[PDB]
Design a protein around this nucleic acid. Structure first.
Ligand SMILES: [Cl-]
Ligand SMILES: [Cl-]
Ligand SMILES: [Cl-]
Ligand SMILES: [Mg+2]
Ligand SMILES: [Mg+2]
Ligand SMILES: [Mg+2]
Ligand SMILES: [Mg+2]
Ligand SMILES: [Mg+2]
Ligand SMILES: [Mg+2]
Ligand SMILES: [Mg+2]
Ligand SMILES: [Mg+2]
Ligand SMILES: [Mg+2]
Ligand SMILES: [Mg+2]
Ligand SMILES: [Mg+2]
Ligand SMILES: [Mg+2]
Ligand SMILES: [Mg+2]
Ligand SMILES: [Mg+2]
Ligand SMILES: [Mg+2]
Ligand SMILES: [Mg+2]
Ligand SMILES: [Mg+2]
Ligand SMILES: [Mg+2]
Ligand SMILES: [Mg+2]
Ligand SMILES: [Mg+2]
Ligand SMILES: [Mg+2]
Ligand SMILES: [Mg+2]
Ligand SMILES: [Mg+2]
Ligand SMILES: [Mg+2]
Ligand SMILES: [Mg+2]
Ligand SMILES: [Zn+2]
Lengths: 100, 77, 100, 50, 71
RNA sequence: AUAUGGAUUCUUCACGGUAACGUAACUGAAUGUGGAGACGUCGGCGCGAGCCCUGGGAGGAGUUAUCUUUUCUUCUUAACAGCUUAUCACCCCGGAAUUGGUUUAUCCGGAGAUGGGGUCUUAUGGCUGGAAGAGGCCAGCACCUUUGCUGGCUCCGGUGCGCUUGUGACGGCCCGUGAAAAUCCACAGGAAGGAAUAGUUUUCAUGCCAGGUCGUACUGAUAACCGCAGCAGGUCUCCAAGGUGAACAGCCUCUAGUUGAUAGAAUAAUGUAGAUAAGGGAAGUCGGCAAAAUAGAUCCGUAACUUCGGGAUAAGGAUUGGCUCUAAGGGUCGGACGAUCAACUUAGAACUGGUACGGACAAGGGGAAUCUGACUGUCUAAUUAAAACAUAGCAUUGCGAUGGUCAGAAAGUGAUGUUGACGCAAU
RNA sequence: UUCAAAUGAGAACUUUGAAGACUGAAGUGGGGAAAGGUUCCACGUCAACAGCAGUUGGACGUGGGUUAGUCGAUCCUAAGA
């Protein structure tokens, strides 16, 4: 039945003032301010979420290694595999049609 | 804040030139369904991280305590 | 799967003053310990021995230190000994009566 | 409020120091006719207008 | 303030309103020949600035205080 | 700022996996492209966290005429870090009508379903490090004392249309489709820079230095703000225990907080506030003003009229406590049936009483018509809430931009206009 | 609201203890945004103020108190200026 308070000066329930209730090693309940959840990067062509890419706030990508931000393929962290497949098939067939 | 499970890398940390202090913690815990055993923890204070090695066998614990470098500040309990 | 549990009660201090009777105290537990229901179902499941200085209870049934303290407090109140005798625990499942 | 600019806090500091009684030794000076501080302020009677 | 000297190894000073933490640390080192761990500052309600100066472990604040002249 | 280790290079700028993609690293200028920042509301469903409820055990307290293996209370684990953990999505194999799969909610499949085997986001959870050395609960000892010492325990479970909150996949709605920018990252591109007795990567690990300035006390209101005041007024928001019950209703209690508002004595009239009345029942009064009556839930039953949606809780009836029982409605586990565990939901039957039972609290009066406005909505702050205003619908009027309507003292000046007749403007 | 003790020249009103009650988690609880500006805390202390009282106080006198690389401001842009 322990009640909690905000730990900052903002007294309103905005998107940047969300809290979670946790229990401390001291045995009491205390509010825990939580950052807004991240959004997965999306494919450039179809707009679907990219597989194999970490989900973080924009500034946090500068701290992680490059292996978390790309895929070992052309357009790795930009376009998904299916859209890359469509690009290659279209490129080959159109250029062949140009010759004929 | 970091745990190591290999003794070979533990001795390398004790001579990293930035380590000056260490502590030994003895814990009296119960195993799955047997008699109580003494558990010891070796904690190395690095510049950025604290490394903890935990071994549950007292026979190997005694050897590791002796093998610690003589120039390292070791705190017992 | 029902290994016996031993409870030891030391009455050395109260009997020294002579205001306590260890034999009667052990007999009270015989006629008041409930086991799987009502009183008197001690089918070689609860035994309360006596040697003149300590009280030993060994039970293979539902018994606990809290229940033992509960029955001991009832006996002390019956004989008006709450103002002198206190049921104190020294170690796990080992107890004593303090005269103070 | 707890949130205050530097200018406001500096203004409040001066008003605190001006709110004090007149020293007694000044009243014994030759040709002295000053008796009490006529500009005394209480926080609940007159507001600073700030 | 005297409690922080003997116990916390911290010297308390009144400083000019125009001085920042860099200047306070520099001034203490040359005035009293001591090393400074860190400096915390605040502006008092009367319009003056107070600095909490903590010396390094190699120095004792109490020995500095009685050498300055205040005990 | 910089060094070492590691990685890489004589095929100069890494390898594995059919693939989804994996990793401790693993050159990338101009320029270009893309992503994150970055977004409405309502509904049910899944999952998580805290809280609530509860079993065993280890301590302390309370009650003890009698009863109660009883009543109350303590049993906790931060940021961060390592490993692991997922609906959705995607990949490979395979080729489907006797169509199958599948949500509470009907959608999906030869543009490749079901099924078998894999990949990925880490919301979230688990274990470990942080970390028991802390914190919590007790016991045995010293003592004006600067105030202490030594001991133990701090454990293992269950449950859900629960409450609060977060989140995921979906669904409904619009002539309404529900910010911007700073900032960070990836890719495309290939300008340059580069090895053999030698170089390069500070997007891998470790190590070194620094992080200024201003705010920070307290009240936040029946006494710290505004109303001339320590004024029954006014003033934005977060946290939210148990019982009764549909319930953030009323009523009682735990934690915490108050016990403040000039008092004493007496009990006349008249008042203010709260109440009850024999018989009659609106005869009172401009007028049923005021008050009374009705009230929850279950079952039965329900007219004229109607824009077919309503009217409707129409109207009008019956039942309701306590106690002892019965019947039906589920999960999981080794393969045809058993064992075991855990939810309040509904229906029915006996017995029982001063015939009482939504027992306090809570809680619709109804019917037959006329005038008027269609409806919801809106205004005379401090005497008027209405039939007044608005509204959808209907109709008229101007205008094709060198224009209509309107603004400005003027202007190399403005609104409609990020507009173009399914528009703007004026009635 | 009541009893007793303590303090004091003086106590229906201050302090401590005991008892009886209320707010009943959309609180008379625990934090804040505006606004106020030292009202915060201790010691001393009662002429005036707290529409009775007063030994008490948000009163009077004298002092003490607000510590940040991580919470805000600072930076960005919104209608607009
Ligand atoms: Cl302030
Ligand atoms: Cl009267
Ligand atoms: Cl009409
Ligand atoms: Mg903000
Ligand atoms: Mg004052
Ligand atoms: Mg005021
Ligand atoms: Mg500061
Ligand atoms: Mg504060
Ligand atoms: Mg004012
Ligand atoms: Mg005014
Ligand atoms: Mg209910
Ligand atoms: Mg009557
Ligand atoms: Mg009658
Ligand atoms: Mg009449
Ligand atoms: Mg008449
Ligand atoms: Mg009426
Ligand atoms: Mg109307
Ligand atoms: Mg409505
Ligand atoms: Mg009016
Ligand atoms: Mg009116
Ligand atoms: Mg009209
Ligand atoms: Mg314009
Ligand atoms: Mg009430
Ligand atoms: Mg009450
Ligand atoms: Mg005060
Ligand atoms: Mg008075
Ligand atoms: Mg007086
Ligand atoms: Mg004063
Ligand atoms: Zn794509």
């Amino acid at each position: 039945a322990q009640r909690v308070t905000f730990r900052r000066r903002n007294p309103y329930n905005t998107r940047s003032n969300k809290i979670k209730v946790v229990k401390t090693p001291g045995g009491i309940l205390r509010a825990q301010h939580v950052k807004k959840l991240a959004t997965r990067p999306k494919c450039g062509d179809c707009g679907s979420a990219l597989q194999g890419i970490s989900t973080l706030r924009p500034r946090q990508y500068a701290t992680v290694s490059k292996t978390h931000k790309t895929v070992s393929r052309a357009y790795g962290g930009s376009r998904c595999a299916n859209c890359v497949k469509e690009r290659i098939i279209r490129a080959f067939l159109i250029e062949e049609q140009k010759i004929v | 804040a970091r745990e190591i499970t290999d003794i070979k890398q533990f001795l390398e940390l004790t001579r990293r030139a930035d380590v000056k202090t260490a502590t030994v913690k003895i814990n009296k815990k119960l195993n799955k369904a047997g008699k109580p055993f003494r558990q010891t923890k070796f904690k190395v204070r690095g510049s950025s991280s604290l490394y903890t090695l935990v071994i549950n066998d007292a026979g190997k614990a005694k050897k590791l305590i002796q093998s610690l470098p003589p120039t390292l500040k070791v705190n017992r309990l | 799967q029902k290994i016996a549990k031993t409870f030891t009660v030391d009455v050395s201090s109260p009997t020294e003053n002579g205001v306590f009777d260890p034999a009667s105290y052990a007999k009270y537990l015989i006629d008041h310990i409930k086991v799987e229901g009502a009183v008197g179902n001690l089918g070689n499941a609860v035994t309360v021995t006596e040697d003149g200085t300590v009280v030993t209870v060994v039970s293979t049934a539902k018994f606990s230190g809290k229940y033992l303290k509960y029955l001991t407090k009832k006996y002390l109140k019956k004989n008006q000994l709450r103002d002198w005798i206190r049921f104190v625990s020294t170690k796990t499942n080992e107890y004593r009566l303090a005269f103070y | 409020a707890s949130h205050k600019t530097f200018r406001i806090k500096r203004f409040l500091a001066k008003k605190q120091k001006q709110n004090r009684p007149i020293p007694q030794w000044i009243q014994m000076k030759t040709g002295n006719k000053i008796m009490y501080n006529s500009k005394r302020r209480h926080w609940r009677r007159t507001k600073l207008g700030l | 303030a005297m409690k922080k000297v003997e116990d916390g190894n911290i010297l308390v000073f009144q400083v000019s309103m125009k001085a920042n933490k860099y200047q306070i640390k520099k001034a203490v080192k040359e005035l009293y020949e001591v090393d400074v761990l860190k400096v915390n500052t605040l502006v008092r309600p009367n319009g003056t600035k107070k600095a909490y100066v903590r010396l390094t472990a190699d120095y004792d604040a109490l020995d500095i205080a009685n050498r300055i002249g205040y005990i």
